[PDB]
Amino acid sequence: MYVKLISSDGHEFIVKREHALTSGTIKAMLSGPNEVNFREIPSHVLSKVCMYFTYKVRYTNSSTEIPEFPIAPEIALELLMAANFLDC
C-alpha cells in the first residue's frame, strides 16, 4: 500500500504511493500499491546518502550550478574526499 523507511535512529519516514518519483530507490521497494530498513550503520552515512539522492534526482542535466555537497569542517579535506569515503 504505502511504504516506510526505518533507520538505526528511527527515521521512520512515510513514503508515498503515487508521486514518489523524487525517490529512485524506494520506488523499487514499493510493496504495494513496506518496512524498508537500513539500521546497521549510523545515520551520518544514511541521511547523507538520502539527501545526496534528493540532490542528485534534481541536479542532473544542469549546465548551471551543480554544487559540491557541504561536508563537515574538521573533514573539510573530506569535503572532496567524501568521493573517497561516503559519496558526497
Partner: protein, 360 residues
C-alpha cells in the same frame, strides 16, 4: 587616431552584434566623437539577445561617455533587466528540464539540437564556457555530417571572439578539412551554402592573428558571390577588401596578374570595390603615386578595421616596398628625382627608405 571615412550606416545594416560594439571600441581607442549614438543603438541591441551583463557594461561605459558628455554636447531599464534575467534563468531551468525530457525522448537530433540552442543562449548570455560545454556535448552527439558542420559553424561564430587559435583552429579546421566537405559535393555542388566562405573569413581572422597572411589570402581567393550574408562577419564589400588587399599584399606579380585579375570567383567582389580595382590598375601599371596615395588613405579606414588595424601597418609597408621594388627592377640607372616624383617623396628620405631596403 580619428578617420571620418567610415560607413556606420552599412555596418548597422550589413552587421550587428559585438563588432558594432567593438568598432566603437577602436573609436573608444582612437577615433572619438563617433561613439555615443552607436553606443545607444548597441545598448538597444543588447535589449535583445538575452544579454544583461554586457547590457549593464554598455550602460556603464555609456555613463563613462556621459561623464565625457559633461563636455561634449544612459539607459538601464531595470524592470527589463530583472524581468528578462528571471525569464532567462527560468528558461535555463525549463531547458534543463527539457534536456531531461528529451533524453527521456532520446532523439539525438533533438537532444544535440538542444545542446546547440543552449550554446546559442549562452552566447546570448556571453557564457562562452557554458556554450563550450553545450557544443562540447553537441560535439560527437550528432546524426549526420552536415550537423557536425553546423556545430562547428556555431563554434566558429564563437571563435570570432574566442580567437584562441591552438584548438580554436582545431574547430576551424574541423569545419575546414575534416567533414569531407558536403560529403564530396563542395557545399552541395556549386556552393550557395555560406560555409566555405565562412571558412575564408575564419582563416582570415586566424592568420590575421597567427600572421601567416599568405595562406590567409590563399584561402580568401575563391569566395562565392552567391550568398554574401551574415550580420556579424560577412558583408561582401568588407570581405572583398579583406581578400583583395591580403592578396595584393602577400602574392607576387606572377600571381597578381595570374590569380588577381583572373580571379573570377572574386571578380564581382572587386566589382563591389571600385577603389581597390583602381589601386590594382595603378599598381599593375606602376602608377605608384596615386596608388600608394589611395592605399594610405584607406590605411586609416582599415585601421578603423579593428582586426586589420595592427596588420595594415605591416602590410601597406610591404605594398609600398613592393612598389619600390617595382620601380627599382627594370633599370641600370634611375634618377631619384624621377623616383621622388613617382613616390610623392623627397630624395633623401626616399634614400633612407631605400637604405633601409639596402640593409637586406
Amino acid at each position: 587616431v580619428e578617420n571620418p571615412s567610415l560607413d556606420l550606416e552599412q555596418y548597422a545594416a550589413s552587421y550587428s552584434g559585438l563588432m558594432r560594439i567593438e568598432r566603437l571600441q577602436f573609436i573608444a581607442d582612437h577615433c572619438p566623437t563617433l561613439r555615443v549614438e552607436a553606443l545607444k543603438m548597441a545598448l538597444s541591441f543588447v535589449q535583445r539577445t538575452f544579454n544583461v551583463d554586457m547590457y549593464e557594461e554598455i550602460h556603464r561605459k555609456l555613463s563613462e561617455a556621459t561623464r565625457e558628455l559633461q563636455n561634449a554636447p544612459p539607459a538601464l531599464d531595470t524592470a527589463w533587466v530583472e524581468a528578462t534575467r528571471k525569464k532567462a534563468l527560468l528558461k535555463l531551468e525549463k531547458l534543463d528540464t527539457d534536456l531531461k525530457n528529451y533524453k527521456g525522448n532520446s532523439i539525438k537530433e533533438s537532444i544535440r539540437r538542444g545542446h546547440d540552442d543552449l550554446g546559442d543562449h549562452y552566447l546570448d548570455c556571453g557564457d562562452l564556457s557554458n556554450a563550450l560545454k553545450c557544443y562540447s556535448r553537441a560535439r560527437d552527439y550528432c546524426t549526420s555530417a552536415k550537423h557536425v558542420i553546423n556545430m562547428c559553424l556555431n563554434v566558429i561564430k564563437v571563435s570570432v571572439y574566442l580567437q584562441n587559435w591552438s584548438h580554436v583552429l582545431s574547430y576551424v579546421s574541423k569545419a575546414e578539412s575534416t567533414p569531407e566537405i558536403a560529403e564530396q559535393r563542395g557545399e552541395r555542388d556549386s556552393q550557395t551554402q555560406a560555409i566555405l566562405t565562412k571558412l575564408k573569413c575564419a582563416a582570415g581572422l586566424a592568420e590575421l592573428a597567427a600572421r601567416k597572411y599568405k595562406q590567409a589570402a590563399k584561402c580568401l581567393l575563391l569566395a562565392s558571390f552567391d550568398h554574401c550574408d551574415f550580420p556579424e562577419l560577412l558583408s561582401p564589400s568588407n570581405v572583398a577588401i579583406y581578400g583583395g588587399l591580403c592578396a595584393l599584399a602577400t602574392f607576387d606579380r606572377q600571381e597578381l596578374q595570374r590569380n588577381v585579375i583572373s580571379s573570377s570567383s572574386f571578380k564581382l567582389f572587386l566589382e563591389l570595390e571600385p577603389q581597390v580595382r583602381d589601386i590594382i590598375f595603378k599598381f599593375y601599371e606602376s602608377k605608384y603615386a596615386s596608388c600608394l596615395k589611395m592605399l594610405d588613405e584607406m590605411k586609416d579606414n582599415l585601421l578603423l578595421d579593428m582586426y586589420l588595424a595592427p596588420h595594415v601597418r605591416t602590410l601597406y609597408t610591404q605594398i609600398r616596398n613592393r612598389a619600390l621594388i617595382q620601380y627599382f627592377s627594370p633599370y641600370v640607372s634611375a634618377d631619384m628625382h624621377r623616383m621622388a616624383a613617382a613616390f610623392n617623396t623627397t630624395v633623401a628620405a626616399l634614400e633612407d627608405e631605400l637604405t633601409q631596403l639596402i640593409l637586406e
